[PDB]
Design a protein around this ligand. Structure first.
Ligand SMILES: [Cl-]
Ligand SMILES: [Cl-]
Ligand SMILES: [Mg+2]
Ligand SMILES: [Mg+2]
Ligand SMILES: [Mg+2]
Ligand SMILES: [Mg+2]
Ligand SMILES: [Mg+2]
Ligand SMILES: [Mg+2]
Ligand SMILES: [Mg+2]
Ligand code: NA
Ligand code: NA
Ligand code: NA
Ligand code: NA
Ligand code: NA
Ligand code: NA
Lengths: 95, 154, 140, 156, 186
RNA sequence: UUAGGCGGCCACAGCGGUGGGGUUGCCUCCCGUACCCAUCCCGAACACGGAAGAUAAGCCCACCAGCGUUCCGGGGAGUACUGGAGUGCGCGAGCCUCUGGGAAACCCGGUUCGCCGCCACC
RNA sequence: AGUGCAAGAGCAAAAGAUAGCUUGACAGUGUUCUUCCCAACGAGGAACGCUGACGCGAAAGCGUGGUCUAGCGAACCAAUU
RNA sequence: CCUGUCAAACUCCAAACUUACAGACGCCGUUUGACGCGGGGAUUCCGGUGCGCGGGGUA
């Protein structure tokens, strides 16, 4: 890469298809998950806060407690265990 | 149920391919195993497709091989009708073979080694650079085509 | 059907597009209520570079305040036709514009469940001339 | 310079003028020839079909087209036919003209990428195929071997 | 509309009915919403919660079913508002609902407005709602005193036939009084 | 749901168009400014108070496909591209065979003029 | 369109405009991610909390500077609280 | 309206494929103790080739 910022190479994943443009529905930004639940991490280009480092877009971790409103999802980066602070806006229930 | 015979060595073959062959219990050239026709098994032989020979064997042929090349999970013991009868749920080789073909049981379930270490093809095979439709000995075969290979490697 | 379809005057805006005022006074008397400043946008050569800046005033008259004004304004005008809106409006003159529409307009001006008026329920240049002309004067 | 240096479609597509500057103008004079006032209302329609994907520098396009159309004056300056070269030289080509250090070249020309089987030229003629000859001279000046294909014309 | 790239607003925004930005703030509390809505002739008060396929209304009250308790006055006014709030508030209590936040939808937070009146009522019914006392009306206007005094400048009954001539903020008391003990649907 | 309130999905729901519907459950337009409140000017809006009138707007209901959209059939196409294999072909560029996947444009014909949840209600 | 500045991205009852008011560009201490994919490594950066005190708002709530990714510096020594 | 062409820094579309998690089969581990944890000792940080995909370059 020509530079090493967090958005380097994120033009694709952090953009919306023209029709999904504009403010997202609140229902999901308010979803309540329980510890133990599997959730898919995917940033919502429309929602500025509650994000995580792009690299983890695609991961499916396990909710383990929360911090403030945000949740703490455990994921495994390659072989390393990591804890990710993400808001519901960017989470989906697996299955 | 198909019969798998590895016809190509390990040198240079993708690891994930070699591993598959290993998961299907074949670790040497000319070694053969019987595999149920399932989605999961189908996907594995498709992957191993270019280094193996496979097809559905005829009852007889299976029997001949079972008789000539079957082995206990351990030891030299010949697997003959008697062995079969005194050690398995069946009464004789034919009984066993029918069970394998109909995929009702497996070589392990009956205390037999998952592997039929065949002999090199008497007369040689059709080559390992082309598939069957091309005159080679690789890929899927005819029940008659698989038999001839198995039989020559009896 | 009618009664709720027959035209009516909704606001008459009287504004003096000056270029920098003392003119408010006359607008206050000529109408009957306070005028409003007219800031401008964009910086331009007519020494009008100032963004927020008084450059005219206006007065939006409604109801009687509007008629009682038109009952002297119109007479001072002659024109008609071509000089009319596609929505049945018209401006003559110091400027004096007249906005005309039918009974259910609030539907497009309210906050909740607002909606734009359907072309059919809109006012045409013709249906307008008629309404006004039929009120102390002549068309073209 | 030689066609050898640019006849292969091995490099990335390089055409964004928004990031390329100093691109030389095309030598191709025209694309529509003959009676361009008229539309393809002709009995016979022959085409010159390139038989291999290649890159053709505007150089070759002009030389090819000229040699063909210039010849189609076996029919006359205002003859009845219409000739069309359908491809355009979009692909910008460079040259590293220091050695291999900072070798990204400088713009030196343009070329058109044609894929085997496309028709680069289409002529429209009445049963009077002098055009077939205009093309034996045209493919004479482009890298690939070519196929002279006739379309509407069972007037053999 | 125009093309494949065109962006159409969410249905409830097209209909200009829901202000989603505010709705998100509302939902934040994690508490039920006390939906305060109006109509030219009526006033509605609902207690909504969140749900898998959309909102759930656990307790509601409409200015029309107010008469069902002895209301013999118009229903698009202050006293009516308060009461409808109190009514819903109580049904709310019965439902096992203890707290909620005020959703005034697309209305304006003007002081002493009917919504706030609706809020006051629901509060008094026993419901716990984040509020601000001095944004509410001064009890008398809630009773409907501003109206009785308006009919004082009579010469012609403020009420076409209806009930009374000089109107009755007392009728208000009599009703609130009623809702505060026993009775059906509460 | 003989017209309501809050929503979910967020165009299958958009754009445009036709027909129908209200002594009342109703929603509206509508009437009107003493009050709470309100317009850098206007009770336009916002807010409050109210029913003389109206179903013309909106809204609700039934429907139209011309545009935009969703999905499906047949054709394009098992084409383009492609994971695995080859002492197959080609000066080469590159192509071909076996095996596992598999498109886009476009045409023609259907579909689509929202679906669903909770509450309230002759 | 605008949103201070590259490029890419976000945003319309707004993240833009206008008006008004305000100083959360606050003190303290952390969690996590990043810096350094995987996989050890400082400064720096961010996201998200808590404690204290505040601003605005009817209120839910928003404010841990500017919508996001650049704008930065160890030990020793000095001045400063 | 008709007609002729393009895109590494275009996208109304869109694979093969790669990839997170989960189940299933397979294989493996529970005296051959896997997965993992803690510690001792390194070597190593001139690589090269074939094939696929590349970027630069006439090569
Ligand atoms: Cl993170
Ligand atoms: Cl409302
Ligand atoms: Mg990319
Ligand atoms: Mg053994
Ligand atoms: Mg021999
Ligand atoms: Mg051979
Ligand atoms: Mg009607
Ligand atoms: Mg910020
Ligand atoms: Mg990849
Ligand atoms: Na969105
Ligand atoms: Na040099
Ligand atoms: Na040639
Ligand atoms: Na001013
Ligand atoms: Na109507
Ligand atoms: Na750090």
């Amino acid at each position: 890469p020509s530079s090493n910022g967090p958005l380097e190479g994120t033009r694709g994943k952090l953009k919306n298809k023209p029709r999904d443009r504009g403010t997202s529905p609140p229902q999901r930004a308010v979803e309540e998950f329980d510890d133990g639940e599997k959730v898919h991490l995917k940033i919502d280009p429309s929602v500025p806060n509650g994000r995580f480092h792009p690299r983890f877009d695609g991961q499916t971790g396990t909710v383990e407690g929360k911090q403030g409103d945000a949740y703490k999802v455990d994921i495994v980066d390659g072989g390393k265990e990591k804890t990710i602070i993400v808001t519901a806006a960017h989470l989906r229930r697996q299955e | 149920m198909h019969a798998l015979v590895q016809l190509r060595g390990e040198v240079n073959m993708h690891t994930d391919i070699q591993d598959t062959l290993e998961m299907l219990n074949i670790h040497h050239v000319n070694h053969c195993t019987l595999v149920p026709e399932t989605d999961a098994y189908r996907g594995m032989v498709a992957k191993v497709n270019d280094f193996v020979a496979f097809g559905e064997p005829s009852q007889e042929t299976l029997e001949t091989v079972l008789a000539t090349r079957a082995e206990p999970l351990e030891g030299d013991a010949d697997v003959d009708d008697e062995w079969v009868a005194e050690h398995t749920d069946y009464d004789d080789i034919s009984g066993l073979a029918f069970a394998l073909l109909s995929e009702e049981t497996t070589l392990r379930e009956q205390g037999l080694s998952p592997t039929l270490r065949l002999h090199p093809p008497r007369g040689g095979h059709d080559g390992v650079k082309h598939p069957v439709k091309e005159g080679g000995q690789l890929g899927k075969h005819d029940t008659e085509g698989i038999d001839d290979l198995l039989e020559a490697m009896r | 059907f009618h009664e709720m379809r027959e035209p009516r005057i909704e606001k008459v805006v009287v504004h003096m597009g000056i270029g920098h005022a003392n003119a408010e006074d006359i607008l206050g008397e000529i109408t009957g209520q306070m005028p409003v400043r007219t800031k401008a946008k964009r910086t331009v050569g007519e020494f009008d570079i100032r963004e927020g800046d008084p450059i005219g005033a206006k007065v939006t008259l409604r109801d009687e305040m509007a008629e009682e004004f038109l009952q002297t304004a119109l007479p001072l005008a002659e024109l008609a036709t071509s000089q009319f809106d596609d929505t049945g409006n018209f401006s003559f003159g110091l400027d004096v514009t007249v906005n005309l529409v039918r009974p259910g307009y609030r539907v497009a001006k309210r906050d909740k469940a607002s909606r734009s008026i359907p072309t059919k329920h809109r006012l045409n240049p013709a249906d307008a001339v008629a309404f006004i002309e039929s009120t102390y004067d002549v068309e073209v | 310079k030689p066609g050898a240096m640019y006849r292969n479609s091995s490099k990335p597509a390089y055409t964004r003028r928004e990031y390329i500057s100093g691109i030389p103008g095309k030598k191709i004079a025209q694309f529509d020839m003959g009676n361009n006032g008229a539309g393809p209302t002709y009995p016979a329609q022959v085409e010159l079909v390139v038989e291999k994907p290649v890159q053709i520098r505007h150089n070759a396009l002009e030389a090819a087209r000229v040699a063909a159309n210039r010849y189609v004056q076996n029919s006359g300056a205002a003859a009845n036919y219409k000739f069309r070269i359908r491809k355009f030289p979009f692909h910008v080509i460079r040259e590293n003209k220091d050695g291999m250090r900072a070798p990204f070249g400088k713009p030196v020309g343009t070329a058109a990428r044609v894929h085997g089987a496309n028709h680069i030229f289409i002529a429209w003629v009445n049963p009077d195929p002098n055009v077939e000859e205009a093309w034996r001279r045209a493919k004479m000046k482009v890298t690939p071997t070519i196929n002279i294909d006739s379309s509407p014309a069972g007037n053999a | 509309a125009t093309g494949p790239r065109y962006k159409v607003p969410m249905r409830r925004r097209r209909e200009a009915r829901t202000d989603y930005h505010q709705r998100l703030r509302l939902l934040k509390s994690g508490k039920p919403r006390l939906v305060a809505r109006k109509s030219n002739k009526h006033v509605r008060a609902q207690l909504v919660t969140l749900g898998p396929n959309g909102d759930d209304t656990l307790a509601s009250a409409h200015s029309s079913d107010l008469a069902e308790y002895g209301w013999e006055a118009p229903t698009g006014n202050m006293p009516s508002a308060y009461l409808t709030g109190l009514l819903a508030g109580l049904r709310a209590q019965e439902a096992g609902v203890e707290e909620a936040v005020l959703d005034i939808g697309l209305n304006s937070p003007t002081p002493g407005s009917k919504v706030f009146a609706i809020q006051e009522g629901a509060i008094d019914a026993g419901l716990d709602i984040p509020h601000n006392d001095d944004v509410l009306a001064d009890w008398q206007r809630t009773r409907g005193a501003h109206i009785a005094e308006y009919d004082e400048q009579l010469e012609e009954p403020l009420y076409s036939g209806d009930f009374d001539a000089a109107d009755l903020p007392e009728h208000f008391d009599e009703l609130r009084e009623t809702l505060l003990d026993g009775d059906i649907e509460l």
